Amino acid sequence: KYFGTDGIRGEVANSTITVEFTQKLGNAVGSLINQKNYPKFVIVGQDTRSSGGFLKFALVSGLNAAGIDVLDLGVVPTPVVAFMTVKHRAAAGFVITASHNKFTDNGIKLFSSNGFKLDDALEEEVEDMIDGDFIYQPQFKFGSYKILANAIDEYIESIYSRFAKFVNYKGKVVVDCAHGAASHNFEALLDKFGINYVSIASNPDGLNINVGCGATCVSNIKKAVKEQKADLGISLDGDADRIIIVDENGQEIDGDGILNILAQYSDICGGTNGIVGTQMTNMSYENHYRANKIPFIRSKVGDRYVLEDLVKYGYKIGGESSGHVINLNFGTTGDGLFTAIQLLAIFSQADKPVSEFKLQGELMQQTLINVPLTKKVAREDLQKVASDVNDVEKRLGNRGRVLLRPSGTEPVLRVMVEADDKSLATNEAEYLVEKVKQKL
Amino acid sequence: KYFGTDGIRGEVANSTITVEFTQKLGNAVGSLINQKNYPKFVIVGQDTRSSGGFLKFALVSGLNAAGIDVLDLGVVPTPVVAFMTVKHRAAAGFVITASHNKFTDNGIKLFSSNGFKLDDALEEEVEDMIDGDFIYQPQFKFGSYKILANAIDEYIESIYSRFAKFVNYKGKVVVDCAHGAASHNFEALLDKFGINYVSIASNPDGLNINVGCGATCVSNIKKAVKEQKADLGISLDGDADRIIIVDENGQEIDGDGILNILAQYSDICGGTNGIVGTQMTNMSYENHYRANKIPFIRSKVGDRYVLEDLVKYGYKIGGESSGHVINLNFGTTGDGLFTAIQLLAIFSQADKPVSEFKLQGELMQQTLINVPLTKKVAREDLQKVASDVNDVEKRLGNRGRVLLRPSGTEPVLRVMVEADDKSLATNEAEYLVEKVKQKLV
Numbered sequence: 001k002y003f004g005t006d007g008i009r010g011e012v013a014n015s016t017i018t019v020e021f022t023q024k025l026g027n028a029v030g031s032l033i034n035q036k037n038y039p040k041f042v043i044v045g046q047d048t049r050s051s052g053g054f055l056k057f058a059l060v061s062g063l064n065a066a067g068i069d070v071l072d073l074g075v076v077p078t079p080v081v082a083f084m085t086v087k088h089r090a091a092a093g094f095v096i097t098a099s100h101n102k103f104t105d106n107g108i109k110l111f112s113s114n115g116f117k118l119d120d121a122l123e124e125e126v127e128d129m130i131d132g133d134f135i136y137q138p139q140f141k142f143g144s145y146k147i148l149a150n151a152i153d154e155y156i157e158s159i160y161s162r163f164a165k166f167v168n169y170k171g172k173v174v175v176d177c178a179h180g181a182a183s184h185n186f187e188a189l190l191d192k193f194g195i196n197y198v199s200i201a202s203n204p205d206g207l208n209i210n211v212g213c214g215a216t217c218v219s220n221i222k223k224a225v226k227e228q229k230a231d232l233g234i235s236l237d238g239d240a241d242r243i244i245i246v247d248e249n250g251q252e253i254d255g256d257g258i259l260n261i262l263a264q265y266s267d268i269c270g271g272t273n274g275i276v277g278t279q280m281t282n283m284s285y286e287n288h289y290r291a292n293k294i295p296f297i298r299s300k301v302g303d304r305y306v307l308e309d310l311v312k313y314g315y316k317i318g319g320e321s322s323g324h325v326i327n328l329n330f331g332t333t334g335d336g337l338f339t340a341i342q343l344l345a346i347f348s349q350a351d352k353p354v355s356e357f358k359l360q361g362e363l364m365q366q367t368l369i370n371v372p373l374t375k376k377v378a379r380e381d382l383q384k385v386a387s388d389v390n391d392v393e394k395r396l397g398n399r400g401r402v403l404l405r406p407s408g409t410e411p412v413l414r415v416m417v418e419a420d421d422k423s424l425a426t427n428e429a430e431y432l433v434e435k436v437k438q439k440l
Numbered sequence: 441k442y443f444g445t446d447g448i449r450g451e452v453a454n455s456t457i458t459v460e461f462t463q464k465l466g467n468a469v470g471s472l473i474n475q476k477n478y479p480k481f482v483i484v485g486q487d488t489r490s491s492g493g494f495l496k497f498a499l500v501s502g503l504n505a506a507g508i509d510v511l512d513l514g515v516v517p518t519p520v521v522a523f524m525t526v527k528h529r530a531a532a533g534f535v536i537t538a539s540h541n542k543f544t545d546n547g548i549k550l551f552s553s554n555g556f557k558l559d560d561a562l563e564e565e566v567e568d569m570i571d572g573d574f575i576y577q578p579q580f581k582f583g584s585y586k587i588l589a590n591a592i593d594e595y596i597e598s599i600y601s602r603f604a605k606f607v608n609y610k611g612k613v614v615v616d617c618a619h620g621a622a623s624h625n626f627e628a629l630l631d632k633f634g635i636n637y638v639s640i641a642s643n644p645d646g647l648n649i650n651v652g653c654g655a656t657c658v659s660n661i662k663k664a665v666k667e668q669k670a671d672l673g674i675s676l677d678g679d680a681d682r683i684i685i686v687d688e689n690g691q692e693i694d695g696d697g698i699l700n701i702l703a704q705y706s707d708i709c710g711g712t713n714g715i716v717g718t719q720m721t722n723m724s725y726e727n728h729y730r731a732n733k734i735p736f737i738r739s740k741v742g743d744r745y746v747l748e749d750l751v752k753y754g755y756k757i758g759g760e761s762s763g764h765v766i767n768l769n770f771g772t773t774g775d776g777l778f779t780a781i782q783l784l785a786i787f788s789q790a791d792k793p794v795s796e797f798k799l800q801g802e803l804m805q806q807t808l809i810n811v812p813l814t815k816k817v818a819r820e821d822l823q824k825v826a827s828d829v830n831d832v833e834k835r836l837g838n839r840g841r842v843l844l845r846p847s848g849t850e851p852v853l854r855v856m857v858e859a860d861d862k863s864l865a866t867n868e869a870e871y872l873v874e875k876v877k878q879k880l881v
């Protein structure tokens with residue numbers, strides 16, 4: 001199995017990310033395209049990792065052999081490849097990236113012609129092909145390779161034409177691009193809006209992606225904002241599908257907080273009948289949505305579930321804690337750059353600091369206790385402690401909740417309780433911990 | 441073993457020329473470059489085959505993985521890749537081409553940093569490396585890939601600076617680029633000198649390279665010259681390292697004939713102390729060189745032997761009947777474009793037509809007879825008939841010669857006699873055939 005959690009990603013030459021697997025993957029996707037009679041044309045992009053190039057050309061040789069043409073966008077954020085894949089009539093889109101992962105990793109993200117990340121069924125169809133034989137286009141109609149000049153232009157202009165009328169931001173912004181795909185691309189977008197910004201990590205050398213910077217190292221942007229006495233800090237990850245921001249006091253606002261702000265200005269964000277979050281979304285937001293009559297859905301936690309739930313309910317704006325924010329009014333995937341622009345459009349509506357747009361009042365605190373077991377789990381074993389979870393939640397009322405999740409890969413039950421009162425979160429967590437030992 | 445008679449060439453997929461092999465080859469050479477502490481930089485080019493693109497990218501992924509940068513010149517003649525390899529400080533040059541082979545074949549030609557085709561010893565190193573494991577640059581220092589814009593300009597300008605003043609050709613030329621790597625390129629070079637020409641095969645579509653055209657199909661240019669009433673015909677093969685020309689009558693002048701012309705104007709060609717030919721060189725040319733006191737050497741049949749003999753004797757101009765012509769005053773390999781301009785520089789010297797540059801008189805004729813045997817023919821087998829070969833040649837004097845050859849590792853002996861008199865060539869070949877049948881197997 002090649003996909004699974006994350007989906008094709010590992011250390012270079014110490015994983016599945018070898019030059020031979022990637023060549024075979026390219027060919028396999030090409031064979032599926034030929035089989036399905038889709039356009040013999042795909043789009044490729046990459047982040048800043050030095051291994052990206054050779055892995056890309058490996059993919060390309062596989063594709064070309066299959067008879068598929070490749071248009072190279074070079075170094076662009078993940079959302080740009082999806083964008084061009086939908087805009088133009090490509091059969092699929094590839095991104096050579098390991099996203100937020102350490103610089104020694106890499107992988108491939110796959111998008112279908114509709115611009116969406118491959119689904120469970122499509123991934124297994126690809127894998128069946130990979131384990132098949134390498135196939136050469138039977139009529140010798142082999143594919144070409146072209147590099148698109150000024151590749152980011154279309155995406156930039158698409159975003160500008162939609163938000164130029166709203167954006168009027170005059171504050172000082174610190175931008176952390178993780179030395180990743182958003183390097184330079186993000187600044188070119190910002191210039192288009194005449195934004196006063198400062199870059200702190202837009203100098204890729206092929207080995208510094210996500211190193212002590214970007215969305216997964218929010219400490220960097222928080223210190224820079226304080227240092228620079230900035231009004232806002234925007235931090236993106238390696239492929240820029242993840243965004244985290246900080247306010248004027250260097251206070252972090254995560255994917256949950258960001259989604260809450262967009263929700264509050266959903267008209268400017270294109271409109272939405274509801275908001276999709278996850279099992280991890282802070283209840284302070286759930287309470288806020290209910291108080292303002294905004295439908296809220298907790299998705300089955302991460303990897304493509306937020307998208308499937310958005311489509312299921314006809315909602316447009318959804319996101320997760322890590323910073324993956326999706327707006328179906330414009331994109332088909334998490335987009336840090338596009339979310340940044342929405343935010344800047346929002347911050348232009350009121351003459352108040354960024355911290356005043358943020359959900360007011362202290363967010364709920366969490367207590368997590370990993371209960372070590374010696375035996376496996378299951379669903380019927382989770383139903384033995386259901387009555388005790390309900391008791392806790394009944395007594396917590398609107399001031400807290402319970403989340404029980406198994407590890408699946410190890411005999412461990414993670415018991416979490418989040419509440420307004422941390423003293424109380426830790427109390428009820430310890431209570432549940434004891435009940436599971438008695439019941440299991 | 442991967443280097444063969446043609447040196448890494450074969451049917452696409454259905455051979456050793458797969459995406460995986462090409463990927464291991466790219467890397468392999470990368471490792472050798474790292475091992476030898478050479479510049480981590482190589483030049484890449486290709487012919488018009490549609491299969492060249494994907495094979496190239498396979499190669500490149502392997503090179504990059506090894507830590508090697510790649511400068512891609514796109515579709516250009518083989519000699520161009522060597523020019524750029526030598527001019528710039530690259531460690532090697534790659535050509536994705538199967539040369540004159542049918543459109544269904546492909547392959548890779550390799551040049552060292554000195555711009556010469558890899559020798560036997562260097563080939564072995566590669567083969568030993570390939571059989572290694574696939575090696576990733578240990579410090580995560582992976583290669584880049586860049587496409588050079590207007591890739592052929594330096595080549596064209598170099599040939600132009602040299603010949604601009606030699607060349608003043610006013611005749612009508614027909615060019616056959618074999619729908620190959622010279623398509624458009626050769627026209628661009630010919631434009632530099634204001635040549636009056638007509639193109640008949642510079643419309644590549646990835647499947648028509650060498651199809652009923654180019655150096656391996658001289659009929660195309662012969663017929664074109666007649667209908668066009670042209671003064672000259674120039675035909676190149678798929679990667680343009682061969683050249684065959686045609687005079688105003690549609691009469692073919694092959695590599696032997698071209699080399700003889702360069703010999704007569706060796707000074708305008710940079711100079712040369714002697715000429716290197718092959719075992720196939722028509723003895724009429726050999727008699728001609730001897731008559732004009734030009735040292736002549738017969739090389740051991742093509743396969744990089746002409747260049748090895750050029751270097752050894754310190755000569756500059758050599759070639760073979762196929763049309764591979766080498767001038768060490770400028771290039772390091774066979775180049776049909778440069779040879780073309782050299783000829784037009786020569787044809788600018790006299791107010792006579794192309795047919796009058798040829799060796800005047802009838803060339804000798806040949807009779808080839810194959811003799812099937814039980815085993816491949818070794819030198820001990822050729823010694824058994826040495827006395828009969830000597831007898832025939834002794835009686836032929838200057839009017840002919842013998843050439844006996846094995847068929848590589850095939851169980852066949854090739855008996856050839858070259859003579860002024862065709863009847864006699866057939867007679868003597870038949871005689872030797874009978875001697876072989878009596879003495880061998």
Ligand SMILES: [Zn+2]
Pocket residue numbers: 099100237238239240241242
């Ligand atoms: Zn990411």
Ligand SMILES: [Zn+2]
Pocket residue numbers: 539540677678679680681682
């Ligand atoms: Zn050739």
